[PDB]
Scaffold this active site. Structure first.
Site, PDB file in Angstrom:
ATOM      1  N   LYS B  78       0.848  -1.188   0.000  1.00 45.37           N
ATOM      2  CA  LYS B  78       0.000   0.000   0.000  1.00 45.37           C
ATOM      3  C   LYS B  78       0.880   1.233   0.000  1.00 45.37           C
ATOM      4  CE  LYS B  78      -3.242   0.110   3.214  1.00 45.37           C
ATOM      5  NZ  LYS B  78      -4.489   0.681   3.774  1.00 45.37           N
ATOM      6  N   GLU B 104     -13.273  -1.383  -3.632  1.00 47.93           N
ATOM      7  CA  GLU B 104     -13.154  -2.836  -3.492  1.00 47.93           C
ATOM      8  C   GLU B 104     -13.029  -3.290  -2.028  1.00 47.93           C
ATOM      9  OE1 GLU B 104     -10.523  -1.157  -2.905  1.00 47.93           O
ATOM     10  OE2 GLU B 104      -9.144  -1.575  -4.561  1.00 47.93           O
ATOM     11  N   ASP B 106     -12.531  -2.069   2.272  1.00 46.51           N
ATOM     12  CA  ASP B 106     -12.381  -1.226   3.456  1.00 46.51           C
ATOM     13  C   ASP B 106     -11.316  -1.885   4.347  1.00 46.51           C
ATOM     14  OD1 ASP B 106     -12.634  -0.187   6.122  1.00 46.51           O
ATOM     15  OD2 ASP B 106     -14.701   0.422   5.717  1.00 46.51           O
ATOM     16  N   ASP B 107     -10.133  -1.268   4.407  1.00 49.57           N
ATOM     17  CA  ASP B 107      -8.980  -1.820   5.120  1.00 49.57           C
ATOM     18  C   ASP B 107      -8.795  -1.126   6.475  1.00 49.57           C
ATOM     19  OD1 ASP B 107      -6.593  -3.226   5.731  1.00 49.57           O
ATOM     20  OD2 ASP B 107      -5.356  -1.849   4.584  1.00 49.57           O
ATOM     21  N   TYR B 182      -5.855  -9.197  -0.143  1.00 50.57           N
ATOM     22  CA  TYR B 182      -6.686  -9.679  -1.236  1.00 50.57           C
ATOM     23  C   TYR B 182      -6.148  -9.256  -2.589  1.00 50.57           C
ATOM     24  CZ  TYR B 182      -9.671 -11.319   2.419  1.00 50.57           C
ATOM     25  OH  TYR B 182     -10.143 -11.968   3.528  1.00 50.57           O
ATOM     26  N   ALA B 183      -5.949 -10.246  -3.451  1.00 50.84           N
ATOM     27  CA  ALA B 183      -5.507  -9.998  -4.807  1.00 50.84           C
ATOM     28  C   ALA B 183      -6.742  -9.978  -5.689  1.00 50.84           C
ATOM     29  CB  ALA B 183      -4.525 -11.067  -5.257  1.00 50.84           C
ATOM     30  N   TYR B 184      -7.058  -8.794  -6.208  1.00 49.82           N
ATOM     31  CA  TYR B 184      -8.245  -8.592  -7.042  1.00 49.82           C
ATOM     32  C   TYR B 184      -7.927  -8.860  -8.513  1.00 49.82           C
ATOM     33  CZ  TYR B 184     -10.136  -6.808  -2.722  1.00 49.82           C
ATOM     34  OH  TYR B 184     -10.562  -6.712  -1.420  1.00 49.82           O
TER      35      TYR B 184
HETATM   36  N1  LIG Z   1      -5.355  -5.401  -3.758  1.00 47.33           N
HETATM   37  C1  LIG Z   1      -5.560  -5.039  -2.459  1.00 47.33           C
HETATM   38  N2  LIG Z   1      -5.564  -3.725  -2.128  1.00 47.33           N
HETATM   39  C2  LIG Z   1      -5.769  -3.332  -0.846  1.00 47.33           C
HETATM   40  C3  LIG Z   1      -5.972  -4.293   0.131  1.00 47.33           C
HETATM   41  N3  LIG Z   1      -6.149  -3.652   1.303  1.00 47.33           N
HETATM   42  C4  LIG Z   1      -6.054  -2.327   1.064  1.00 47.33           C
HETATM   43  N4  LIG Z   1      -5.823  -2.137  -0.248  1.00 47.33           N
HETATM   44  C5  LIG Z   1      -5.659  -0.816  -0.918  1.00 47.33           C
HETATM   45  O1  LIG Z   1      -5.896   0.246   0.017  1.00 47.33           O
HETATM   46  C6  LIG Z   1      -7.176   0.849  -0.181  1.00 47.33           C
HETATM   47  C7  LIG Z   1      -7.929   0.829   1.134  1.00 47.33           C
HETATM   48  O2  LIG Z   1      -7.306   1.763   2.003  1.00 47.33           O
HETATM   49  P1  LIG Z   1      -7.848   2.072   3.480  1.00 47.33           P
HETATM   50  O3  LIG Z   1      -9.149   1.317   3.621  1.00 47.33           O
HETATM   51  O4  LIG Z   1      -6.745   1.560   4.366  1.00 47.33           O
HETATM   52  O5  LIG Z   1      -7.990   3.574   3.526  1.00 47.33           O
HETATM   53  C8  LIG Z   1      -7.864   0.018  -1.240  1.00 47.33           C
HETATM   54  O6  LIG Z   1      -8.671   0.834  -2.096  1.00 47.33           O
HETATM   55  C9  LIG Z   1      -6.709  -0.622  -1.990  1.00 47.33           C
HETATM   56  O7  LIG Z   1      -6.172   0.282  -2.961  1.00 47.33           O
HETATM   57  C10 LIG Z   1      -5.961  -5.633  -0.232  1.00 47.33           C
HETATM   58  O8  LIG Z   1      -6.148  -6.505   0.642  1.00 47.33           O
HETATM   59  N5  LIG Z   1      -5.760  -5.982  -1.513  1.00 47.33           N
HETATM   60 MG   LIG Z   2      -7.707   1.942  -4.024  1.00 45.75          MG
END
Ligand SMILES: Nc1nc2c(ncn2[C@@H]2O[C@H](COP(=O)(O)O)[C@@H](O)[C@H]2O)c(=O)[nH]1
Ligand SMILES: [Mg+2]
Ligand SMILES: Nc1nc2c(ncn2[C@@H]2O[C@H](COP(=O)(O)O)[C@@H](O)[C@H]2O)c(=O)[nH]1
EC number: 2.4.2.8
Lengths: 202, 207
Positions: B78, B104, B106-107, B182-184
């Protein structure tokens, strides 16, 4: 006689086209409606080079309407507000993206309308693109399928005969193609796609 | 570890979420990053009914991070976006509209908090410019909803409103998921391998 396309197929079609599309060096992408939206995103993955920023994708909708007392006219249902977007088309390589070239009318009018935008923005700043060609907007087209039928509308000869201007992932027979994002039963859709050879073709 | 998600998995995730998103009645869908494009267009298909207009979809960058070149084929990458590049792009008419924000995952929730805040400001600024008092005529308010495929079971570095999160008709996560990477599938540069791994891990068809 309906042709079912899987997601994995689309992904691969955008993957194998991205290499020749990088020759066009697109500065921005304009995706037509619901058809161009996903191809545009998948392309973007394979267009990203280490160091250069992710290019913007702009979503437009064109609605065509018939004669009204010499041609078929267009209403801009969803367009780019260049003012609030701060988007200059002047001097850019612009890639127009859709899913299928059928009769070629949508692409013809999309290009026509966008050429109008480009010219109007250049003449607003007092630029003559025929005297100074470096500020001219360069349009390219990417499509997944170009149906081998006779077209109802044309594209510029220069763009059409150039493999680095017009990009059709696959020239296909004149059939109705079902795209995976249009499906409400993706299991059935994918079964048919694999069976018809419209999946994982490499 | 790394959890591979197939396209067909994404399709079905949108499928099982569409009926409750209908309760929110969105006028437009906004993809706020690269992960929102595919979900937004699939949703549109499932939201369609006879006698009901096709929902409009827009892509407007309100992302804090990105991931395109970085793939371990490290995986869990990230990278925050450089402020050297001005990513203050397009504006939409938000007044009197129900707006579905799509991404995609919410992290840590910083991205959705930021996107919501920005969009809420835009709408308030549009309303004031038009001479509208959204308190005296509340039908001119902009209602925001959020759809995400995955919502990670972990601490959050930013907050969304509790009333929004608690409401299954305003915060839509297709699946509440453990803290993994997660790999999208739109990120894959080897979709054959990606799909095969996804099938092996039970991240394909589930309906
Ligand atoms: N491909 C992928 N991207 C992630 C993942 N977790 C966070 N991200 C990236 O971080 C963003 C979420 O950021 P946050 O929710 O921490 O503000 C997502 O839109 C994506 O770009 C993940 O598990 N897989
Ligand atoms: Mg993103
Ligand atoms: N799903 C699907 N849509 C098509 C097909 N052929 C044409 N279309 C629709 O018509 C548009 C292109 O038509 P044209 O303007 O080239 O005649 C596409 O953007 C799409 O919306 C097809 O085979 N399958």
């Amino acid at each position: 006689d309906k042709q079912y396309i899987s997601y994995n197929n689309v992904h691969q079609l955008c993957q194998v086209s991205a290499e020749r599309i990088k020759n066009f060096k697109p500065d921005l992408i304009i995706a037509i409606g619901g058809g161009g939206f996903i191809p545009a995103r998948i392309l973007r993955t394979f267009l990203k080079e280490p160091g250069v920023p992710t290019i913007r994708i702009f979503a437009i909708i064109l609605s065509l309407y018939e004669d009204l007392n010499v041609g078929v006219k267009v209403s801009r249902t969803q367009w780019i507000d260049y003012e609030q977007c701060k988007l200059d088309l002047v001097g850019k390589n612009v890639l127009i993206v859709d899913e299928v070239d059928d009769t070629r009318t949508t692409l013809h009018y999309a290009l026509s309308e966008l050429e109008k935008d480009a010219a109007e923005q250049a003449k607003a700043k007092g630029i003559d693109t025929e005297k100074s060609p470096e500020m001219k907007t360069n349009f390219g087209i990417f499509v997944l399928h170009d149906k081998q039928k006779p077209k109802k509308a044309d594209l510029p000869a220069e763009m059409l005969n150039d493999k680095n201007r017009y990009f059709a992932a696959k020239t296909v027979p004149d059939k109705w193609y079902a795209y995976p994002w249009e499906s409400t039963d993706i299991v059935f859709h994918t079964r048919m796609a694999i069976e018809q050879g419209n999946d994982i073709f490499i």
